[PDB]
């Protein structure tokens, strides 16, 4: 009816949005019930990066974490993956969109990071960009630990070690189940005949720099065995040195 | 002073749609299309600067970037500075020049004085 043509009009507005105030019908989108229909009327695939930054701003600011999760999984993350794949870098507006999406961390981890990791096709540039984005944002310890348990339990991809390492650089107090999952993942790399890159070695090195004081002696010797079986000419002496000069408790 | 045989007083007191017969085709087309919000905001600014002036003193200068303004008879007496891309040019609004645009009163380029030619 009359609502449909107004939302076609604001669809035409959002396809060319650069700056300024948006219509007030756009800002009351989360307060409505049938949001998916009017959102598909607004055609988010044809949005401008500034318009999607404002949409992420609005949707993150208005509570209801499940709906923010659905918006991040359905609209924001495909746009990010399409922009990295074609432009080989992330836009300024979309970068601040992902930061304002990390304003809501619970919908972010379960909507942006974990679906990207379980998609399997996550490239290295996407890993670097998203890891820098989680590096900039201060993250709650519970959400970071749950995401680290998630990424530890998953099947390995080369992009996963960057996320794991940049989560270990946060230097938070770690739950001991999380460290058990990390050690079990690395000891799951014990019998792999695949050549592992320097990224995996750097993730292990980071785990030994920051959490060597909270490692049991049995898993310490297991990590020494791990270094023995899967060596590197450069990093493995340093990981061995850091494991040798560690005090527990 | 008179404009198409019409003097300034009955230019001011005349309503809007009889001015849609006394301009050129361009100005009639523009004012029939309707003026933008920025035109109307500058119009309020100019009338505010005109009302808030001493009777013997000229009004305060209103500076604007607008170059597509059509001078209506309401702005005769306004003290207006127009941007030409680099610098403001301040002008009195005279009544013999109502049928013109503001932007032609601030020229956006310099007259060319040719120097001695180089190697070519």
């Amino acid at each position: 009816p009359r609502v449909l043509e107004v939302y076609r009009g604001v669809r035409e507005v959002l396809s060319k949005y650069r700056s300024g105030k948006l219509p007030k019908a756009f800002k009351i989108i989360p307060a409505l019930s049938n949001w998916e229909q009017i959102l598909y009327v607004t055609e988010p695939e044809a949005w401008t990066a500034a318009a999607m930054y404002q949409a992420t701003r609005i949707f993150a600011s208005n509570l209801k974490e499940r709906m923010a999760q659905r918006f991040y999984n359905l609209v924001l993350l495909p746009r990010v993956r399409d922009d990295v794949a074609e432009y080989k870098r992330l836009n300024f507006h979309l970068y601040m969109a992902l930061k304002k999406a990390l304003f809501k961390p619970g919908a972010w981890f379960k909507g942006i990071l974990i679906p990207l990791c379980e998609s399997g096709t996550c490239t290295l540039r996407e890993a670097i960009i998203v890891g820098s984005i989680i590096t900039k944002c201060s993250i709650p310890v519970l959400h970071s630990s749950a995401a680290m348990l998630k990424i530890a339990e998953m099947e390995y991809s080369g992009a996963n070690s960057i996320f794991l390492r940049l989560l270990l650089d946060k230097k938070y107090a770690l739950p001991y189940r999380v460290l058990d999952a990390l050690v079990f993942h690395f000891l799951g790399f014990r019998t792999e005949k695949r050549e592992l890159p320097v990224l995996w070695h750097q993730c292990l090195l980071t785990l030994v720099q920051r959490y060597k004081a909270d490692l049991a002696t049995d898993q310490k010797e297991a990590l020494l065995e791990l270094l023995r079986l899967q060596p590197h000419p450069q990093l493995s002496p340093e990981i061995r040195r850091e494991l040798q000069s560690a005090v527990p408790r | 002073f008179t404009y198409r045989g019409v003097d300034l007083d009955q230019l001011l007191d005349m309503s809007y749609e009889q001015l849609m017969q006394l301009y050129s085709a361009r100005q009639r087309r523009r004012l029939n299309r309707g003026l933008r919000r920025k035109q109307h905001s500058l119009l309020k600014r100019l009338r505010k600067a005109k009302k808030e002036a001493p009777p013997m003193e000229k009004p305060e200068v209103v500076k604007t970037h607008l170059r597509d303004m059509i001078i209506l008879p309401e702005m005769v007496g306004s003290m207006v500075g127009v941007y030409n891309g680099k610098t403001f040019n301040q002008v009195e609004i005279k009544p013999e020049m109502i049928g013109h645009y503001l932007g032609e009163f601030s020229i956006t380029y310099k007259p060319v004085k040719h120097g001695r030619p180089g190697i070519g």
Binding site: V3, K24, A25, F109, K150 | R33, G34, L35, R36
Partner: peptide, 30 residues
Amino acid sequence: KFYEQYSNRLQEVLNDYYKEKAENCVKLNT
């Protein structure tokens, strides 16, 4: 919570949008 997870105002805003779209070109007031 992570692994186990998986109108009068409307018409008033419509009227405000229509008024805002009408106020872009006023063409009437002197």
